[PDB]
Design an enzyme around this catalytic site. Structure first.
Site, short mmCIF file in Angstrom:
data_model
loop_
_atom_site.label_atom_id
_atom_site.label_comp_id
_atom_site.label_asym_id
_atom_site.label_seq_id
_atom_site.Cartn_x
_atom_site.Cartn_y
_atom_site.Cartn_z
N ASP A 13 0.93 -1.05 0.10
CA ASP A 13 0.11 -0.04 0.14
C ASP A 13 0.90 1.09 0.07
O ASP A 13 0.45 2.28 0.04
CB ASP A 13 -0.90 -0.11 1.18
CG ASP A 13 -2.21 -0.62 1.06
OD1 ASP A 13 -2.99 -0.02 0.16
OD2 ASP A 13 -2.50 -1.65 1.54
N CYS A 32 23.31 46.82 9.85
CA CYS A 32 21.89 46.52 9.79
C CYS A 32 21.38 45.52 8.94
O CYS A 32 20.87 46.01 7.81
CB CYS A 32 21.07 47.83 10.09
SG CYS A 32 19.47 47.49 10.66
CA LIG Z 1 1.11 -0.03 3.39
#
Ligand SMILES: [Ca+2]
Ligand SMILES: *[C@@H]1O[C@H](CO)[C@@H](O[C@@H]2O[C@H](CO)[C@@H](O[C@@H]3O[C@H](CO[C@H]4O[C@H](CO[C@H]5O[C@H](CO)[C@@H](O)[C@H](O)[C@@H]5O)[C@@H](O)[C@H](O)[C@@H]4O)[C@@H](O)[C@H](O[C@@H]4O[C@H](CO)[C@@H](O)[C@H](O)[C@@H]4O[C@H]4O[C@H](CO)[C@@H](O)[C@H](O)[C@@H]4O)[C@@H]3O)[C@H](O)[C@H]2NC(C)=O)[C@H](O)[C@H]1NC(C)=O
Ligand SMILES: *[C@@H]1O[C@H](CO)[C@@H](O[C@@H]2O[C@H](CO)[C@@H](O[C@@H]3O[C@H](CO[C@H]4O[C@H](CO)[C@@H](O)[C@H](O)[C@@H]4O)[C@@H](O)[C@H](O)[C@@H]3O)[C@H](O)[C@H]2NC(C)=O)[C@H](O)[C@H]1NC(C)=O
Ligand SMILES: *[C@@H]1O[C@H](CO)[C@@H](O[C@@H]2O[C@H](CO)[C@@H](O)[C@H](O)[C@H]2NC(C)=O)[C@H](O)[C@H]1NC(C)=O
Ligand SMILES: [Ca+2]
Ligand SMILES: [Ca+2]
Ligand SMILES: [Cu+2]
Ligand SMILES: [Cu+2]
Lengths: 693, 644
Positions: A125, A660
Site C-alpha cells: 500500500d 543592519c
Molecule cells: Ca502499506
C-alpha cells in the site's frame, strides 16, 4: 465507533467555472442562467483526477460536492484514540498513493518507495496501481492530540506521495483533522462553520503528457493560483454569521518556493493568539486561525502581492443575518502643586494637523566614486543616462504653519517615513489632512477598521469607501480614526503591533513616489511615561523599502532637471531602469542614520518593509550583533512578509557599528547595511514615584 | 587552591576538504564506448576541532557525530558561564568566526566589529564572551537553545562552500557534569539548504573535470545549471545522511537551523511523526517551514522503529535530494546472534593467524579438551566477523581459555566496523578518546559483557586485542537485534503463550507418557517434555492460535532425546492461515521449499524466511524424521497492527 472512510480517484475534468451567486436552498433551486450550447465565450478547462466520495464502489462523474469544495479531496475529521481506516481505489491512470502527514503509521501507511528495509506487503500500500484498489490504516495517537494550549482541532492533510510534483498538480490531497476526545459531540450539533480554505498553485502544465511545437485530448498551458480550486472572484460557498465568529483551516501547496500572501478586504486574523491579518503563508503550511466577524456583507478574501491577482487567488466570502435560537531657541515648562502621583483614567482623542507636500530628497551624504564603482555608484552618482543621488518625491509632514496649527520639526533618525502616530485602544484619531502637492492623493490607515470622516458617516456624494476614491485636488479633509480592540494586540502578542498608512488614489502606485508613514497600536493602564518639549521616547522606527522611481509621478519633472540631455535619453531597458531603483531601508541607502542607541538602552524597535515583494531576512550585527524577543529571543533573524510587519523588544546591552542586516543577495551590497551607536551619560528619574516633567 | 566555578573552552579551526556522495558507479570500461565513470568532487571548507597540534594530532572526531554534515562541531555550553572559542585559520580567503552572541566586547574608541572583521590565513585568533541570559532558553522549556555561527567576511560567499556552526546552549544543572553534554535525551542538528557552488569557493573548485555533456546550449548560464545545485541537509543529497541512530522511546530534540538564499524556505516533514514545540506554550506541529536564517529546535519521539525519512515537501527541491532515513531501534530485544548455537557457521570469520589449530571456528563455551577457542600471538592481531548482512549490535561478550597450567585471556580491545570491509571505523563511543578503549577479563570464563550504546551497525565487526595475559585469545557470541528492530522470542519458551493456543493433530497420551503440545517449547524440560504425534506419518501438524496476527521473522526447531533413543526432525514444511480453515504453503524460488534442519537433538536450529510470513495462525508439518518425530520449539517475530 472508529469510523471508516472509502476513497477513490475518479479522473474528472476541472472548470474554475463562473456564475457564483447562491443557488436557492431547501425545496426548489435553480443554478443561474442556462442559455443553451455554443460558445459561452468559452472557459478553458484542464483534466485532472482527485480523491473522492462513494459509499462502496459506484460509477459517477461530473462537477463539485458541497459547493465550497468539490475539488478539495474528502475531509477526514477525527477524535483522539478511535482509529481511522481507509481504502483507496485507483479508478485513475496515475498509480498514486496516499500519505498522511501528522499521525501514526506502521510502514503500512507512509506511502513511499525508498530504501526502507521491509520488502513488499509493507511497501504494498506504500504505492498502488491503476484499477487496483488498496486499503489503508493508521491511528490517532495520544502523542498526536492538541496541547491544552492549542485550539481544539489541528489543520492537517494528506496526499499521494508517489512523487509529489507530477501528482499534487492534478488533485492529490484532502483535509485531515484531529481533536480532543469526545468531539463528535459539539461539531455534530452547532458549528456549520466548519470551513477549510485551500490556497493552491496548480501548475497544470506538469502532470499530464508532453509536446511543444506551437485534436482530441485535453491540455493547454502554464500556471495557476487558486483557492479550494477556484479563481477570479468565483468560488461558491463561504458564509459566516454576524455576532458569532468562524474558524479557518488552511493548507499551503505549490510544489515550488512560490509563496503567496493573503489579507481579507474586511478583517484581521487570529493565529496562535496574535492579531496579524495577513495569513503570512508559505509554500506548504498548516496554519489555522479565526475571525470575530462583526459587520456584514461580503469581503474580497484575496491574495495580496504582485502578479497573483489577475491569475486568480481572489475569492469572495459572504456573511448574512443568521437565525437565532435562545432558551537661538528653547525655554518653556510650567509648574505649581504636585498631587502625589495623579490617577485620572479613560481615553482621549489624538490630534494631527498633518498634510502631504512635494520636495526633492536624496539618500546621501556619503562618499563618491566614478567609473570603477559600478555598484555603489550606479545610484548616488548620476550620469549621461543616470541621475541617482537625489530625486523629487512627496512625503507626509506635520506642517508648522498651515491654516490649522502644527507641532512638528524632525531629525533624520527616521527617514522619509511619516511622523509616527501612537494609538491607545479605544483611543480615536483626528487627522486634519490637506493636500499641498500637484496630483491629488489620499491617506488611509492599514490596521484599523472604523474610519469614517467624523461629523457624518456619509461619503462624497457618489462613492464607496474613501480609499478607492475621495482624492483631494489641493483641498483639505477632516478624518476620524476610532480604535476598537479588534484593531489591536491580544495578550500573547507584545503590546504595540507595528503598522502604517498611505494614499489609495488607486490602491498602490502613488506610494512608490514617496507617501508613507508608521502607525503604532498598543494598550495598557498601569504606569506610563512621556517627556517634554522636543523630547520623545518611542521613536524607534525602521522600515525597508523598494522605491522604484521608474514609477513615481515625478520621473519627468525629476529627469528634465537632473538629467543632462533634455529627454533624448533612452526609453526603458534593464540598463538605467535598475539604475534608478534606490533601496531605502528607511530611505537613506548604504549608510546614514547610525542611530543613537546607548549602553543598556533598553530598546523597542518598530520595524517593517515595503516597496517590492519577497520575504526578508534582517538583523543586527554590531558590538554584540544582537538578539530580541518575538516571544522567545531570536538570532540573526526577522522574517517580515513585505507590505507586512512586526516590531520587537531589543534590550540593547551591546555596542557600536551595527551592520543592519538586510541579509539578502544583491540587497546587501546593493544598499541597506547601516549602523548603531553606543553612548553614555545623562539621565534622571525620581525615588520611588513620578515627578520629572 | 583548587576548586571550580564554571567555564568552557573549545579548540576549533577552518580547513578545506573534498565533497561528494554516491554509492553506485560504473566499471573501468564495462561499456567500451562510454558511460558514467566520473565522481563529482568538491573543495569546500568546514570547521574542525582538537587540542593545538594542528593536523597530525589531534584534529579529530566521529561516532555520535556521524551526521555532523559539513557542519562544524556541536559547540554546546550551559548558561552564565563562558564560551572560550580559540580559532585557527587553515586555508585561503581570510575567513572569520562569528555568532550573534560575540557580545560583551569591551569598547573604548576601537571597533568590536569594524576591527574584529577578518583574519588573514595562517594567523590565528580567539573570541571569548560571557553567557548572558538575554540570549538563551527560557522558563518555557525546550531545555537547549539553537544559536548559530559562520564567517562574516563576505557573509555568503563563505557560507556556501560549507563552513557552518550549530551553537546551542542549555540551562544550569542540565548537561552531564564533566565530559558530556545533556543525554537526558538525544540531540541532532539538521541544516537544510540549497548549495549552488560557483557562487562559492572559486578557481580550481569550479575547474575540476571539464568539457560538455549530452544536449548543451552554452556555459555560465544554460550549462549544467541545477546540476551544481546540492539540495541537502548537512549536505546529503538523496537519502545519503549518516548518523541517525535513533532510540525508540527516548524523548528527542532536533535543532533545525535552516538558512541559505531566498528559495531555501523548506517546509520540513518527519515521515510519519508528529511532535511539539514552544514559543510560550506547547504549540504542536508536524511540519516546519524553516525560513532562511531561522533556527528553532523541536521535541519529538519515535513510538515505533524501522527506517523513516525527512524532506522539504517542496516537491522540486525534494525530488532532487534533501531527504534522509533515521534508523530507529527497539532497545528492548538485544537478542543473541548465536555464535554459540550453530547458526553463525564456522564459515564466517577470520583473523590473521591460527597460531596452533586454535582458530576461527571456535568461540564461546565450546568445550573440548584444549582446542576449544581461538588464539594468537605477539603481533598486533585482529579478528573479523561477517553477519552475512548488516545488523545492529547492542553489544558483545568475551572469554578465555587455559592451556594446561598457565591461563589465557585478553584485557583491553578496540573495535572496528563497516559494511564491505573497504570502509573501516575505529569505534569511539560515549567516553572521551580518539577511540573507545574497552575492557577484557582475566581468566577463563571472564564474560566481560560490554555494550555499545551508542549502538553500532555494519555487517563486519573486528576486534583488536590491545593487551593480554601471556597469550592473546578468546571466545564470544556478540549480540544485536538487526535492521528493522525485530528477531526476538515470542512466548513459547518464555511461556508467554497459553498451552491452550497450541492445538494440533495426533497427540499420543499414555500411562507415564503424555506428549501433548502443551509441552513443546525450546530448551524446555520436565516430565514428557516435547511433542510426539499418535504415530509418525510424513504429514501431521502443530498449531499456534497466535490469536493476534503477527510478523514472523523465522522459526527455531528442536527435538527431545528420551530414554536411550533421542530423535529430531530433518526436513519439513510450514503453513499459514487466517483461522483454522484456510492454509497457504510457503513456496520459495519456485514450488515448495523443503526446510532443512536438525542434525541432532542436544541443540536447537533455525530457519530464515527470505519473505517474512505474517499471520495470526501458524501450522507446521515435518517430513524427514529420525527414529520418531519429536519436536520442541519457538518462533520469531515482532508486533504489528491487528484486529484486522
Ligand atoms: Ca502499506
Ligand atoms: C552512553 O551514552 C548514552 C546516551 O548517549 C547513555 O545512556 C543513557 O543513560 C541514561 C542514564 O543516565 C538513561 O536515562 C535514564 O532514563 C530513565 C527513564 O526510564 C523511564 O522512562 C523511560 C521513557 O522516558 C520517559 O519517562 C521518563 C520518566 O523517568 C521521563 O523522564 C522522560 O521525559 C520520558 O517521558 C522508559 O523507557 C522506562 O521504562 C522508565 O519508565 C530513568 O529511569 C534513569 O534513571 C533515573 O535515575 C534516578 C536517580 O538515580 C531515579 O530516581 C529514577 O527513578 C530513574 O531510575 C533509575 O534510578 C533508580 C534508582 O534511583 C534505579 O533503581 C533504576 O534502575 C534507574 O537506573 C535514567 O535517567 C538514558 O535512557 C540512556 N540512553 C539510552 C541509550 O536509552 C549512557 O550512560 C552512556 N554510557 C554507555 C552505557 O555507553
Ligand atoms: C482573470 O482576470 C484576468 C484580468 O486581467 C484575466 O486576464 C485577461 O486575460 C485575457 C485572456 O485570458 C486577456 O485577453 C487578451 O488581451 C489582449 C490585450 O492585452 C494583451 O496584448 C497587449 C498588446 O501589447 C500586451 O502588451 C499585453 O501583455 C497582453 O498580452 C488582447 O489583445 C487579446 O486579443 C486578448 O483579448 C486580457 O487582456 C487579460 N486582462 C488584462 C490583464 O488586460 C484572466 O484571463 C482571468 N482568468 C481567469 C482566472 O478567469
Ligand atoms: C603560514 O601559512 C602557510 C600557508 O599559507 C603555512 O604553511 C603550511 O604549513 C604546514 C605546517 O605548519 C604544512 O603542513 C602545510 O603544507 C603548509 N601549507 C602550504 C603548502 O603552504 C605555515 O605553516 C604558516 N606559518 C608559517 C609562517 O610557517
Ligand atoms: Ca515503502
Ligand atoms: Ca496608493
Ligand atoms: Cu500570492
Ligand atoms: Cu524546497
Amino acid at each position: 465507533a472508529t469510523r471508516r472512510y472509502y476513497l477513490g480517484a475518479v479522473e474528472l475534468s476541472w472548470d474554475y467555472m463562473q456564475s457564483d451567486l447562491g443557488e436557492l436552498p431547501v425545496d426548489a433551486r435553480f443554478p443561474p442562467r442556462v442559455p443553451k450550447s455554443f460558445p459561452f465565450n468559452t472557459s478553458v478547462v484542464y483534466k485532472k483526477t482527485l480523491f473522492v466520495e462513494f459509499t462502496d464502489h459506484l460509477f459517477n462523474i461530473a462537477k463539485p460536492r458541497p459547493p465550497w469544495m468539490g475539488l478539495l479531496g474528502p475531509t477526514i475529521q477525527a477524535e483522539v484514540y478511535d482509529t481511522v481506516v481507509i481504502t483507496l481505489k485507483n479508478m485513475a491512470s496515475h498509480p498514486v498513493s496516499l500519505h498522511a502527514v501528522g499521525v501514526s503509521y506502521w510502514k503500512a501507511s507512509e506511502g513511499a518507495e525508498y530504501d526502507d528495509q521491509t520488502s513488499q506487503r509493507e511497501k504494498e500500500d506504500d504505492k498502488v496501481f491503476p484499477g487496483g484498489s488498496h486499503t489503508y490504516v493508521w491511528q490517532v495517537l495520544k502523542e498526536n492530540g492538541p496541547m491544552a494550549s492549542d485550539p481544539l482541532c489541528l489543520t492537517y492533510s494528506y496526499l499521494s506521495h508517489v512523487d509529489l510534483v507530477k501528482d499534487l498538480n492534478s488533485g492529490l490531497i484532502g483535509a485531515l483533522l484531529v481533536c480532543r476526545e469526545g468531539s463528535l459531540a459539539k461539531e455534530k450539533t452547532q458549528t456549520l462553520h466548519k470551513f477549510i480554505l485551500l490556497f493552491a498553485v496548480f501548475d497544470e502544465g506538469k502532470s499530464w503528457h508532453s509536446e511543444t511545437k506551437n485534436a482530441a485530448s485535453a491540455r493547454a498551458w502554464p500556471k495557476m493560483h487558486t483557492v479550494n480550486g477556484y479563481v477570479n472572484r468565483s468560488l461558491p460557498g463561504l458564509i459566516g454569521c454576524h455576532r458569532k465568529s468562524v474558524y479557518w483551516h488552511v493548507i499551503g501547496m505549490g510544489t515550488t518556493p512560490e509563496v503567496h500572501s493573503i489579507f481579507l478586504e474586511g478583517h484581521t486574523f487570529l493565529v496562535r493568539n496574535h492579531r496579524q491579518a495577513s495569513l503570512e503563508i508559505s509554500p506548504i503550511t498548516f496554519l489555522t486561525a479565526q475571525t470575530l466577524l462583526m459587520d456584514l456583507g461580503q469581503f474580497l478574501l484575496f491574495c495580496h502581492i504582485s502578479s497573483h491577482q489577475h491569475d486568480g487567488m481572489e475569492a469572495y466570502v459572504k456573511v448574512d443575518s443568521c437565525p437565532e435560537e435562545p432558551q537661538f531657541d528653547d525655554d518653556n515648562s510650567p509648574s505649581f502643586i504636585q498631587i502625589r502621583s495623579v490617577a485620572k483614567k479613560h481615553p482621549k482623542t489624538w490630534v494631527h494637523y498633518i498634510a502631504a507636500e512635494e520636495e526633492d530628497w536624496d539618500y546621501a551624504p556619503l562618499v563618491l566614486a566614478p567609473d570603477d564603482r559600478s555598484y555603489k555608484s550606479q545610484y548616488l552618482n548620476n550620469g549621461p543616462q543616470r541621475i541617482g543621488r537625489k530625486y523629487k518625491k512627496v512625503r507626509f509632514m506635520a506642517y508648522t504653519d498651515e491654516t490649522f496649527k502644527t507641532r512638528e520639526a524632525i531629525q533624520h533618525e527616521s527617514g522619509i517615513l511619516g511622523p509616527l502616530l501612537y494609538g491607545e485602544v479605544g483611543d480615536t484619531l483626528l487627522i486634519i489632512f490637506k493636500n499641498q502637492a500637484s496630483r491629488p492623493y489620499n491617506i488611509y490607515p492599514h490596521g484599523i477598521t472604523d474610519v469614517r470622516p467624523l461629523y457624518s458617516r456619509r461619503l462624497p456624494k457618489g462613492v464607496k469607501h474613501l480609499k478607492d476614491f475621495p482624492i483631494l485636488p489641493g483641498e483639505i479633509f477632516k478624518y476620524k480614526w476610532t480604535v476598537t480592540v479588534e484593531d489591536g494586540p491580544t495578550k500573547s502578542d507584545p503590546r504595540c503591533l507595528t503598522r502604517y498608512y498611505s494614499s489609495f488614489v488607486n490602491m498602490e502606485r502613488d506610494l512608490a513616489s514617496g507617501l508613507i508613514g508608521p502607525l503604532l497600536i498598543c494598550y495598557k493602564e498601569s504606569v506610563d511615561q512621556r517627556g517634554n518639549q522636543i523630547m520623545s521616547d518611542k521613536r524607534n522606527v525602521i522600515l525597508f523599502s523598494v522605491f522604484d522611481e521608474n514609477r513615481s509621478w515625478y520621473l519627468t519633472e525629476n529627469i528634465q532637471r537632473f538629467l543632462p540631455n533634455p529627454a533624448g535619453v533612452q526609453l526603458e531597458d534593464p540598463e538605467f531602469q535598475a539604475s534608478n531603483i534606490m533601496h531605502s531601508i528607511n530611505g537613506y541607502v548604504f549608510d546614514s542614520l547610525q542611530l543613537s542607541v546607548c549602553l543598556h538602552e533598553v530598546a523597542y524597535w518598530y520595524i517593517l518593509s515595503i516597496g517590492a515583494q519577497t520575504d526578508f531576512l534582517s538583523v543586527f550585527f554590531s558590538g554584540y550583533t544582537f538578539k530580541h524577543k518575538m516571544v522567545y529571543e531570536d538570532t540573526l533573524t526577522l522574517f517580515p512578509f513585505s507590505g507586512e510587519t512586526v516590531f520587537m523588544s531589543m534590550e540593547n546591552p551591546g555596542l557600536w557599528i551595527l551592520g543592519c542586516h538586510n541579509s539578502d543577495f544583491r540587497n546587501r551590497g546593493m544598499t541597506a547595511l547601516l549602523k548603531v551607536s553606543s553612548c553614555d551619560k545623562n539621565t534622571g528619574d525620581y525615588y520611588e514615584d513620578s515627578y520629572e516633567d | 587552591r583548587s576548586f571550580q566555578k564554571k567555564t568552557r573552552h573549545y579548540f576549533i579551526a577552518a580547513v578545506e576538504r573534498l565533497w561528494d556522495y554516491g554509492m553506485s558507479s560504473s566499471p573501468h570500461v564495462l561499456r567500451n564506448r562510454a558511460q558514467s565513470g566520473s565522481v563529482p568532487q568538491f573543495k569546500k571548507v568546514v570547521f574542525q576541532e582538537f587540542t593545538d597540534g594542528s593536523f597530525t594530532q589531534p584534529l579529530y572526531r566521529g561516532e555520535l557525530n556521524e551526521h555532523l554534515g559539513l557542519l562544524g562541531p556541536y559547540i554546546r555550553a550551559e548558561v552564565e558561564d563562558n564560551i572560550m572559542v580559540t580559532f585557527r585559520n587553515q586555508a585561503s580567503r581570510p575567513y572569520s568566526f562569528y555568532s550573534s552572541l560575540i557580545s560583551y566586547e569591551e569598547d573604548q574608541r576601537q571597533g568590536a566589529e569594524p576591527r574584529k572583521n577578518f583574519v588573514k590565513p595562517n594567523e590565528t585568533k580567539t573570541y571569548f564572551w560571557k553567557v548572558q541570559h538575554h540570549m538563551a532558553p527560557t522558563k518555557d522549556e525546550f531545555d537547549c537553545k539553537a544559536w548559530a555561527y559562520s564567517s562574516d567576511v563576505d557573509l555568503e560567499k563563505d557560507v556556501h562552500s560549507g563552513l557552518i556552526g550549530p551553537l546551542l546552549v542549555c540551562h544550569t544543572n542540565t548537561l552531564n557534569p564533566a565530559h558530556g553534554r545533556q543525554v537526558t535525551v538525544q540531540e541532532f542538528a539538521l541544516f537544510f539548504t540549497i548549495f549552488d557552488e560557483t557562487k562559492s569557493w572559486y578557481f580550481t573548485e569550479n575547474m575540476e573535470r571539464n568539457c560538455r555533456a549530452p544536449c548543451n546550449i552554452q556555459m555560465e548560464d544554460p550549462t549544467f545549471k541545477e546540476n551544481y545545485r546540492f539540495h541537502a541537509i548537512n549536505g546529503y543529497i538523496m537519502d545519503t545522511l549518516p548518523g541517525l541512530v535513533m532510540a525508540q522511546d527516548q524523548r528527542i530534540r532536533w535543532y533545525l537551523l535552516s538558512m541559505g538564499s531566498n528559495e531555501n524556505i523548506h517546509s520540513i516533514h518527519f515521515s510519519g511523526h508528529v511532535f511539539t514545540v514552544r514559543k510560550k506554550e506547547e504549540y504542536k506541529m508536524a511540519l516546519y517551514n524553516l525560513y532562511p536564517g531561522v533556527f528553532e529546535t523541536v521535541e519529538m519521539l519515535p513510538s515505533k522503529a524501522g527506517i523513516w525519512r525527512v524532506e522539504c515537501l517542496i516537491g522540486e527541491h525534494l525530488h532532487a535530494g534533501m531527504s534522509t532515513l533515521f534508523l530507529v531501534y527497539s532497545n528492548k530485544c538485544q537478542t543473541p546472534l548465536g555464535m554459540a548455537s550453530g547458526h553463525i557457521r564456522d564459515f564466517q570469520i577470520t583473523a590473521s593467524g591460527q597460531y596452533g589449530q586454535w582458530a576461527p571456528k571456535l568461540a564461546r563455551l565450546h568445550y573440548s579438551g584444549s582446542i576449544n577457542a581461538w588464539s594468537t600471538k605477539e603481533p598486533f592481531s585482529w579478528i573479523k566477523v561477517d553477519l552475512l548482512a548488516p545488523m545492529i549490535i547492542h553489544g558483545i561478550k568475551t572469554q578465555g581459555a587455559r592451556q594446561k597450567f598457565s591461563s589465557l585471556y585478553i584485557s583491553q580491545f578496540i573495535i572496528m566496523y563497516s559494511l564491505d570491509g573497504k570502509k573501516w571505523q575505529t569505534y569511539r563511543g560515549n567516553s572521551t578518546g580518539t577511540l573507545m578503549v574497552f575492557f577484557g577479563n582475566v581468566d577463563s570464563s571472564g564474560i566481560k559483557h560490554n555494550i555499545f550504546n551508542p549502538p553500532i551497525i555494519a555487517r563486519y565487526i573486528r576486534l583488536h586485542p590491545t593487551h593480554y595475559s601471556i597469550r592473546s585469545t578468546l571466545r564470544m557470541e556478540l549480540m544485536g537485534c538487526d535492521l528493522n528492530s525485530c528477531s526476538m522470542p515470542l512466548g513459547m519458551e518464555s511461556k508467554a503463550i497459553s498451552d491452550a493456543q497450541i492445538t494440533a493433530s495426533s497427540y499420543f497420551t499414555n500411562m507415564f507418557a503424555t506428549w501433548s503440545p502443551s509441552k513443546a517449547r525450546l530448551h524446555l524440560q520436565g516430565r514428557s517434555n516435547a511433542w510426539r504425534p499418535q504415530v509418525n506419518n510424513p504429514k501431521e501438524w502443530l498449531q499456534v492460535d497466535f490469536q493476534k496476527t503477527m510478523k514472523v521473522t523465522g522459526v527455531t526447531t528442536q527435538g527431545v532425546k528420551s530414554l536411550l533413543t533421542s530423535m529430531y526432525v530433518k526436513e519439513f514444511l510450514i503453513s499459514s492461515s487466517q483461522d483454522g480453515h484456510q492454509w497457504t504453503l510457503f513456496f520459495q524460488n519456485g514450488k515448495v521449499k523443503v526446510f532443512q534442519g536438525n542434525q541432532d537433538s542436544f541443540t536447537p536450529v533455525v530457519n530464515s524466511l527470505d519473505p517474512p510470513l505474517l499471520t495470526r495462525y501458524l501450522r507446521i508439518h515435518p517430513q524427514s524424521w529420525v527414529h520418531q518425530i519429536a519436536l520442541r520449539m519457538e518462533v520469531l517475530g515482532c508486533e504489528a497492527q491487528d484486529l484486522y
